[PDB]
Design a protein around this ligand. Structure first.
Ligand SMILES: O=c1cccc2n1C[C@@H]1CNC[C@H]2C1
Ligand SMILES: O=c1cccc2n1C[C@@H]1CNC[C@H]2C1
Ligand SMILES: O=c1cccc2n1C[C@@H]1CNC[C@H]2C1
Ligand SMILES: O=c1cccc2n1C[C@@H]1CNC[C@H]2C1
Ligand SMILES: O=c1cccc2n1C[C@@H]1CNC[C@H]2C1
Ligand SMILES: [Cl-]
Ligand SMILES: [Cl-]
Ligand SMILES: [Cl-]
Ligand SMILES: [Cl-]
Ligand SMILES: [Cl-]
Ligand SMILES: [Cl-]
Ligand SMILES: [Cl-]
Ligand SMILES: [Cl-]
Ligand SMILES: [Cl-]
Ligand SMILES: [Cl-]
Ligand SMILES: [Cl-]
Ligand SMILES: [Co+2]
Lengths: 206, 206, 205, 205, 206
């Protein structure tokens, strides 16, 4: 604009597409959840539905630029189609995830990307005891579906989920909520795979 | 149409795509809601469903033209794909929004655009008390998901929502409906983000 | 096929896309409905679901050709993607419309197009009294969403909806069904907008 | 694969796309149904849901080749996107049809195509009497939506639907099932349109 | 990485698309299921809903490369769009399958591909007797929809379904689960068609 249009041109159209991470140029994705609502519980199927937004951060050398060569531009918004994004996936979903926010990300001159999709998720959770004082506890792992730890590592900035935006008049009160890095192994493949395990504890409101 | 086909060619095909707003060339979007129906209430999940159309207006120098150079044409309809549109998003939705109108916008010679999507929206709202005289109040914020106030500002032409087309046989009567600009901050980011807060107060009819 | 492939090439690939109608070159779309079923009624939300097909006709000079220059071809079927179509839209829908027929249209050498989408539609309608003798009446307007009357006019060939293909064992019987041109005004805009108002009166049993 | 990749190249990429049939180069589609399950019945609406796969066969000169010129290849599988397919459409559906099988077809050197989509279909059917010994009978017509009989004809190899794969523990027993060619006429158009009428008779267990 | 972008270019953009298998160059796909949950049962329609992921393996000469010619790269992740995939299909589904995992596969230098879609599946199954001690048994065949045994053969690495990741608090307990190769014939066609028959026996938990 002229600078931003040129910048995006140089970054995207004039290089071949970034082919994702590898054992030789791996990545670390930082995840953090903001829980907005436990919407629904179904005790006949043991499905529970969450609404949250999930903050993703990572960094690529292929997205770096010098602001002085581009009119002192330090960052920009762009369609998530223009860039690689990680295949962060819920391991116990029961319906495809529904996206609630536009697919746009923020890129910064140092190569860092931030992307914060809002989602509705149905997952496997037995709510028995939700009607009590002690409440019930459920959990779901998030991680790359296809990339091992040697390609994609995960971390959290804090193990405390953000509950400052939780709907004050939800049918369910959140007692506590945790996000914790973990390591899994699968029969398909030799390497360790990384997830962040979201653990919520909740109950019917007074 | 000779002139119109040429005009659209000159504007779209012969310039590079407008890359969205920035801190240096920011925008103001004007929003106004027209509420058509409160369709459904679900007291088991605290979700409520609205149908409205949402008027958006903004202006771009990159869409200006001189009507004399183009057969005294002052405006035209065009696919919303041909142009940039703002990522106006509901902050407490619980299902993806459903679009009820075609994705076509109106562009005027002075650069102004008008775009009025019709939508059905499920959002977080506790209807307890709806069956009473006093009714119940619920609220949902609309704003850019990814653009700060330094890129996208919002305003309303009036803080009264338009109820002139509200369904006369809806199960719910509107007592009041309000659209009001506000400023938020989030954990992700230092900058201020702008929303318009739609506040409806309603009850079972008779 | 030689001729038809060439014809379509000449019409579509070798001209710039028709940019829709304007105040200087406006259009008239002719609409007619064929009601097949009232499927469902929901008294708890006042939504009612219809299945119909909706006949659209209009005409463009940019789609004319001389049959002699193209092997005496007078018409052809083509994907609705290949051509401009009008943005005919239900003003009181409560869910996106669901399409039940393929998106293919008929173009004739004189420039006329015919396009008949089948749809299921949920719209705002209070069914109270449907269980009675007198039945109940509901209505929904169809028209362009974005084009004024100075760009798109509507007309019907007849104000009687076509009930010749209505499901004989539907849960609801049609007492009358009407399609009538009308004029509306909106807060956004000074110009008049045109619809055809479909008015159905029906009952159980 | 050398030969097959070349063959497909010669057929698809090096000719212009086949523009569908016409009065001068019409075709005949052969239809046959295999009923797998009556899944659901809804007596509140009078919708009933079927799962079947529908066999389609037709033939095009534009898909012929000589197997000697291509390594003695007599046929191949290909994406249904690569080829024209007929717009066979249920006239009394109440929801868009859901596709349960991949969209791949078989082409043979003589130009014949075979395509067998599996579908779930909701259609207009009143189940009253389903709970009895005699059961109930319902019907739905399948045919081209936009092509007349002068462009697309239909036939069946047999009027007996194939029930050898019907789910033995469905909630509903099929008593009988029929597929029969028919001719319809419409107010839009002068020409006759062709369907195959699927007629099922069934009951609760 | 330079090498990977080039590799993918050489494999995909610079060859004509692989046209699937034939009688002269047939394939064998290896299938294995990992059952995660029996989610729901509907006795009014005899539909039952499963969540599993299905491991697919096969091998193509057209996907081979020499790691030395490409910076000692032995494998990579890629969009399933970039490659042929087999048309493995459930013969008694009642709704389209819902995909729960991203559509990405792993390719290895020897030409082998691995692809593991997660799915939710509604299929024809009568649950009468599920409430008892003996439980009930249901079955669904998976195989190519269009390719005969002379084009696509199937095999399993083991006839035991993997129940190591089955939801411990599902409403239904698995008594046994089996995956077994089998041969069918159809009226359309003279050739034999191959499936793997997944047979599950289950009951209400207690
Ligand atoms: O699709 C792949 C591809 C590679 C590896 C795996 N999967 C799927 C399973 C869940 N993710 C980890 C592991 C098993
Ligand atoms: O995706 C982004 C991108 C940039 C900023 C933000 N988000 C998501 C949240 C909602 N909007 C404001 C803030 C937090
Ligand atoms: O989108 C437009 C664009 C132009 C005009 C209008 N709309 C939407 C509303 C319904 N139709 C008339 C009016 C208001
Ligand atoms: O779409 C067309 C196009 C041409 C003719 C027709 N239709 C649809 C209706 C059903 N088929 C026959 C008739 C009416
Ligand atoms: O679509 C085809 C194409 C070829 C063969 C078949 N079908 C479908 C049915 C199920 N698969 C085997 C057989 C019958
Ligand atoms: Cl600039
Ligand atoms: Cl002109
Ligand atoms: Cl509903
Ligand atoms: Cl729901
Ligand atoms: Cl649209
Ligand atoms: Cl010809
Ligand atoms: Cl329904
Ligand atoms: Cl060969
Ligand atoms: Cl259902
Ligand atoms: Cl029974
Ligand atoms: Cl459900
Ligand atoms: Co006749």
């Amino acid at each position: 604009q002229a600078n931003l249009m040129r910048l995006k041109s140089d970054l995207f159209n004039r290089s071949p597409m970034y082919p994702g991470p590898t054992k030789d140029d791996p990545l670390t994705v930082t995840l953090g959840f903001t829980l907005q609502d436990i919407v629904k519980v179904d005790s006949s199927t043991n499905e529970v539905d969450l609404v949250y937004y999930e903050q993703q951060r990572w960094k690529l050398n292929s997205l770096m630029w010098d602001p002085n060569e581009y009119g002192n531009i330090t960052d920009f918004r762009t369609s998530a189609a223009d860039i690689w994004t990680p295949d962060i996936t819920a391991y116990s979903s029961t319906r495809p995830v529904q996206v609630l926010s536009p697919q746009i990300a923020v890129v910064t001159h140092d190569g860092s990307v931030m992307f914060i999709p809002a989602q509705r998720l149905s997952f496997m959770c037995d709510p028995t005891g939700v009607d009590s004082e002690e409440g019930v506890t459920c959990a779901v792992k998030f991680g790359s579906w296809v990339y091992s730890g040697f390609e994609i590592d995960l971390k959290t900035d804090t193990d405390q989920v953000d509950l400052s935006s939780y709907y004050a008049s939800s049918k369910y009160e959140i007692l506590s909520a945790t996000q914790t890095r973990q390591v899994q192994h699968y029969s398909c493949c030799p390497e360790p795979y990384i997830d962040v395990n979201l653990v919520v504890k909740f109950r019917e409101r007074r």
